[PDB]
Design a protein around this nucleic acid. Structure first.
Ligand SMILES: Cc1c(N2C[C@@H]3CCCN[C@@H]3C2)c(F)cc2c(=O)c(C(=O)O)cn(C3CC3)c12
Ligand SMILES: Cc1c(N2C[C@@H]3CCCN[C@@H]3C2)c(F)cc2c(=O)c(C(=O)O)cn(C3CC3)c12
Ligand SMILES: [Mg+2]
Ligand SMILES: [Mg+2]
Ligand SMILES: [Mg+2]
Ligand SMILES: [Mg+2]
Lengths: 487, 247, 487, 245
DNA sequence: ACGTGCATAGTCATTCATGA
DNA sequence: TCATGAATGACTATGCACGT
């Protein structure tokens, strides 16, 4: 029996826990804004073919695939993570297309795994775009059976777009979501002004990213907290719901709440008001009625007494309920395996850096493949030019190896090319097919020239990110939801 | 006549309505927590209340009364309806003049229907006699046309009909997404439930009628009673002709 | 609003429930002895490639695949059904190879889905043997996306081997498990004496199937109940555990129970004795101690008082505990979509009939495929004899359509065959490669003749079932566990 | 001697030996692992107490709230000893308290939570060396013809693999080396032959050298002061590998 | 009254950091 | 004290038929 000191054990064990939680659980990677479970769920669905070009698969299949290949944890919590990524009130830009009961902004829980189906969304398809072209590093999974991606291509700034909230050890993150179109403008500027220093970049990006854009709409009051978040990495952003005063015909006036701030439970909100009327801490309120429905959305009617001023009651609601509540921004993300609080300019820059890396790696991959096919095509063209001879040679061979070896001698060919000639079908010996081989060589050599040009010019590389991202935004970009007002 | 609805002495699972008028109020007795959850969302909270029932309901024909009254699901139903049972039945205290039973279109939903109808017929018969009991018919298919509004079908025939008509009309469907087939209420979202089973202007309800009470009493006792032999012989005798009951 | 009478509704709805439960849930198909959930789980695992020639897949994947494609029900109960098929104390011949904690014969429940891995057993691979050769009818699944098997090939009598227990509506089944070698002998006799009547067949089969063979070993007392079950389809079979009396150094005696009858919970058994000794209905017992372990198996030590006779206490245990308990046999199975109580000869015969059906259908499948291959090969041979013209023809053709239409005219060939000539690789034009096409034609034509011969001879068909089954039994057959004694 | 159940936790699978000096309590992570352990154990001398979920932090949580926790009550009741000033080692029902958690980080975390409970409520158990840590296997080498071997580290895996191949043994490249990701994945036999069989199990005895230093470390790591913990991790995580060099 | 097996998931308690 | 969000599933109750 080996002896171990309690201090040694405690320090080692707790640090090991803290670090993996920090780096590999609770906090998002800065490049794709994803935690490990998010990334693994999405890739599992992707590899399984659960894409928008096919009907929704049973969500159990997504969980099981994620669990069995990438995420060595429980089915229950993985389903919760998948479900969340499908809720339009949770994610500003949902990555999962859910079919069925995925719950509500209130206390209505999602249906069980057995009831729901799920697939990737079109935007989630942009997260995984060209992942199979060596655009990101892969590592062995938890048992070395298969490979998994360390990070996704993330062809739109997902971290800032969808935000992230996570409790780790010794630290926690709380990045709000943002409007995709505004983020794109920031990225476009970062690409154009690629040499700009941090001071200029921060000023430019802050001008274009006007503030958080919550999926729950609502209001942002003030500009200081937003500015603090972008300048410091920490800031308190005051949120408000939307209240509309209605006057009944010779009746009492009532407050109609149609929107609430981010991450405010509708049922808890109603209950909080109801309980604060009981012992009596919100006088002036006469009646509370939830006229909400699937067709009109949120609609909480608060009828107030006749000897009560509407504006007074609303301020009381702002004071004593989450009708007004603050978002505690803490821009914490994992950068190169290290947790870091980032300015807005750093978040954009780091993302742009990732995009450029992806495009360069994609280009390199395509160039290598383009060369390989060209290499083989060159072989085919040699065969076509001496087609009469090629056939006669193969015929007299006792094996295919003698036929192969001869082809090398005849046309001065590699082993790969001769093999490709051997694998050639009589299909392609038709006139148009022979011409198709010729033209295909011409096409690839043209593509190779294009690819070489890209790798030699950073200008084009930045241009590709801009144009491809622009295409994504034009298709999937939407209006702002959260309205920004002054004090 | 008016009665108070719960808002922050009734079942915890009950999502009551706002209207205090039973004549205008409706109670949707739903199969499963998922379906009940979606119903709670898609309903008209003014006139429609939801009581989700979890698991197969206890057979009041087989189980003794004391055990039945201890069953949480039966208590929920009896309490929600407001009326007593047996001799203490008082229709005046009925909290909903429409009691809609909504179960899956699958075989297990049919079973729950018989168990619920047995509870009603044995404990609260006047609810059936006065036409307060209804059966909601869930959809079986949802046709998702590429450009046109989606259509719901409540049978294989209607599916074939709506498919043919739309195609003839020049509409088109994906052969991938295509026609979604519902295998239960739990697979539906709030909107879907509203537009097929809860919206009073499109819902397909069947009102449970009671003609011969004595004959009904016998059938309930045969199918639901403790006598297995009687039930076995009845099934082997009549299952052969179940298709031809309405021909 | 449409009116419906309560009698019509009740009758229609309950009958619909009863029938599907009877035919499609609780009761086994006579041919493979499987209920729908069993069949769907196994095929899901099979189609997923979760086979013994590859490592155990996470059992969640088997459940999810079964749920998403074949079994429109809950993940929980599906896992339970999968788990059962992996327990050696439940199934006499397990169909699932489980890895991890699958519970115990006591009250120790199996581990959750997340913990366990699972794959098919070699015998389960015989259940599905050549299922892809149209040996069984397939039907569309619950949403028509994919096909599922109506019944498995079941190349060993699984119903009798593993038995079945199920509660339906108006009826229930309880078939005990049996020894594979004994069942095989019965099948071998049935094949040889294919013309024997039911009277003779029952006598023969009952002689070879000495009785049920439970996975929990134990004892069968008497022969009447067994005989009743095989002759009537119902019988009460008296089971007993194994008790061995031990003496102590002091001279105290103790009873050691090392085996229990089928489906007796070990923990409930110990508890029952414990409760029957306090109140005091099993006097003579001094102490109860469970000395069981994973290494010694079941070992319940019952120390008895000095003024106690061993057999008296044992007889009391037989009387007042499940140390002696009867198996209520009721040979109910679905035959051609109809529930039927069957004699043993009927159970064997119906299975043999299924095997013959499988072999004929397999043969038909192989014969059709052989002809197709032969048909195309004949086309290729025609091309080789006029190879100079064929190639010249394809070359001089402006497209592949011109080349194809020409090939038919040139060699008097089908379009399918002409297609094959076009699809031919330049590899196949080598001398030895030309020769293989010739020989392959000669090879297949021999196979076609053989297959035709099989279909024309019922003798060979029966012979194949015998020989193939014999191979399975020699490999996977085991010793008897339950010992049969007289009164 | 003390009576075994056949007034203790319902989850407790007690042993048969009435002698605490010979008795052992395996505190296990999870119902699955605890279930398998209950089967693979030596029921004579080894008792099993499965713990469900993350243990409550007694450093952070108020005293009364800790006493309401079902898992803490289970431990305190099963050990027989009191807590704090009412601690009486004489009533210790097991002279060997083996903590058995997954090799993963969450197992490490549960260990720290348990060690914190013990150090704060029942310190003498640590001081007198009654607390041990079971080291679960990480790999199982499945040789084609030979008996299977278990490995407790990546290095040992590479070594046993190398030795076996050199000795002429062979492994499947499919089944091959099974990697354990937790105790819940193991069956009864596997647990016995790696963590419970006293002749092969790898236990580590928790020793307490400097009580004052330990007190400070516990308060830093487990306390409510986040800043202290944050700075401590950033300060010492960089050198966690080199603690035993 | 209990076991059987295929059908019809929400509730329950902690770690962890932060601000009300 | 509460919400947040990924981490660490056993218990609870009916139908159904049958035998102790
Ligand atoms: C044990 C567990 C819970 N229990 C732990 C507590 C101590 C023992 C008495 N029961 C209470 C409640 C729980 F409330 C939720 C979950 C989950 O939500 C869950 C999940 O997967 O989401 C997994 N587990 C178990 C693995 C630990 C959970
Ligand atoms: C509802 C349900 C159960 N009960 C919980 C509720 C208590 C109060 C009202 N009665 C119900 C019944 C249950 F004890 C087990 C299961 C399961 O084991 C299970 C399973 O999947 O195995 C599924 N369900 C639910 C779908 C109905 C179950
Ligand atoms: Mg949970
Ligand atoms: Mg259903
Ligand atoms: Mg269950
Ligand atoms: Mg673990």
């Amino acid at each position: 029996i080996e002896p171990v000191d309690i201090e040694q054990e405690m320090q080692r064990s707790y640090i090991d826990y803290a670090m993996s939680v920090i780096v590999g659980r609770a906090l998002p990677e800065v490049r794709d804004g994803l935690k490990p479970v998010h990334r693994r769920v999405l890739y599992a669905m992707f590899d399984s073919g659960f894409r928008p070009d096919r009907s929704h698969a049973k969500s159990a299949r997504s969980v099981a695939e994620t669990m069995g290949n990438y995420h060595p944890h429980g089915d229950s919590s993985i389903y919760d993570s998948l479900v969340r990524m499908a809720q339009p009130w949770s994610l500003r830009y949902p990555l999962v297309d859910g079919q069925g009961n995925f719950g509500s902004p209130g206390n209505d829980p999602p249906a069980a795994m057995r009831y729901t189906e799920a697939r990737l969304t079109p935007l989630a398809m942009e997260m995984l775009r060209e992942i199979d072209e060596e655009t990101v590093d892969f590592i062995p999974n938890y048992d070395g059976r298969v490979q998994e991606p360390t990070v996704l291509p993330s062809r739109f700034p997902n971290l800032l777009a969808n935000g992230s909230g996570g409790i780790a050890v010794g630290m926690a993150t709380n990045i709000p979501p943002h409007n995709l179109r505004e983020l794109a403008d920031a990225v476009f500027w970062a690409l154009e002004n690629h040499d700009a220093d941090e001071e200029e970049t921060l000023a430019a990006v802050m001008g274009r990213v006007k503030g958080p854009d919550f999926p729950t709409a609502g209001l942002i009051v003030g500009s200081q907290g937003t500015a603090d978040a972008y300048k410091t990495g920490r800031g308190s952003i005051r949120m408000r719901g939307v209240v509309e005063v209605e006057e009944d015909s010779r009746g009492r006036t009532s407050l109609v709440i149609t929107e609430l701030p981010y991450q405010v439970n509708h049922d808890n909100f109603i209950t909080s008001i109801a309980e604060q009327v009981r012992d009596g801490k919100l006088a002036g309120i006469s009646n509370i009625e939830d006229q909400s429905s699937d067709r009109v959305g949120l609609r909480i009617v608060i009828e107030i007494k006749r000897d009560a001023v509407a504006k007074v009651v609303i301020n009381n609601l702002y004071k004593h309920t989450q009708l007004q509540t603050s978002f505690g921004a803490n821009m914490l993300a994992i950068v190169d395996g290290v947790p870091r609080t980032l300015r807005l300019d750093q978040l954009i820059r780091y993302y742009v850096d990732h995009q450029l890396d992806v495009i360069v790696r994609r280009t390199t991959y395509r160039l290598r493949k383009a060369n390989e096919r060209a290499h083989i095509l060159r072989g085919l063209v040699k065969a076509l030019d001496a087609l009469d001879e090629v056939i006669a040679l193969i015929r007299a061979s006792e094996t295919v190896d003698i036929a192969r070896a001869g082809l090398i001698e005849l046309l001065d060919i590699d082993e790969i090319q001769a093999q490709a000639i051997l694998d050639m079908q009589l299909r392609r010996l038709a006139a148009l097919e022979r011409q198709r081989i010729i033209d295909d060589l011409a096409k690839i050599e043209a593509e190779i020239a294009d690819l070489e040009d890209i790798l030699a010019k950073p200008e084009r590389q930045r241009g590709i990110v801009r144009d491809e991202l622009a295409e994504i935004v034009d298709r999937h970009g939407d209006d702002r939801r959260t309205r920004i007002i002054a004090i | 006549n008016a009665l108070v609805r719960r808002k922050s002495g009734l079942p915890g699972k009950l999502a009551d309505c706002r209207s205090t008028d039973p004549r205008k109020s409706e109670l949707y007795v739903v199969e499963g927590d998922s379906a009940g959850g979606s119903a709670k969302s898609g309903r008209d909270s003014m006139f429609q209340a939801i009581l989700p029932l979890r698991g197969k309901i206890i057979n009041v024909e087989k189980a003794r009364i004391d055990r039945v009254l201890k069953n949480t699901e039966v208590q929920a139903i009896i309490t929600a309806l407001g009326t007593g049972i047996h001799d203490e039945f008082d229709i005046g205290k009925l909290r909903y003049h429409k009691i809609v039973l909504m179960a899956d279109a699958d075989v297990d939903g049919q079973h729950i229907s018989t168990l619920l109808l047995t509870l009603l017929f044995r404990f609260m018969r006047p609810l059936i006699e006065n036409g307060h009991v209804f059966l909601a018919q869930p959809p079986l298919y949802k046709l998702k046309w590429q450009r046109s509004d989606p259509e719901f079908a409540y049978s294989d025939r209607e599916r074939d009909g709506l498919l043919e008509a739309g195609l003839k009309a020049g509409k088109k469907i994906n052969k991938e997404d295509g026609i979604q087939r519902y295998k239960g209420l739990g697979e539906m979202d709030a909107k879907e439930l509203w537009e097929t089973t809860m919206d009073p202007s499109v819902r397909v309800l069947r009102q449970v009628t009671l003609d011969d009470a004595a004959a009904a009493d016998e059938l309930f006792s045969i199918l639901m009673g403790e006598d297995v032999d009687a039930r076995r012989s009845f099934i082997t005798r009549n299952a052969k002709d179940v298709r031809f009951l309405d021909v």
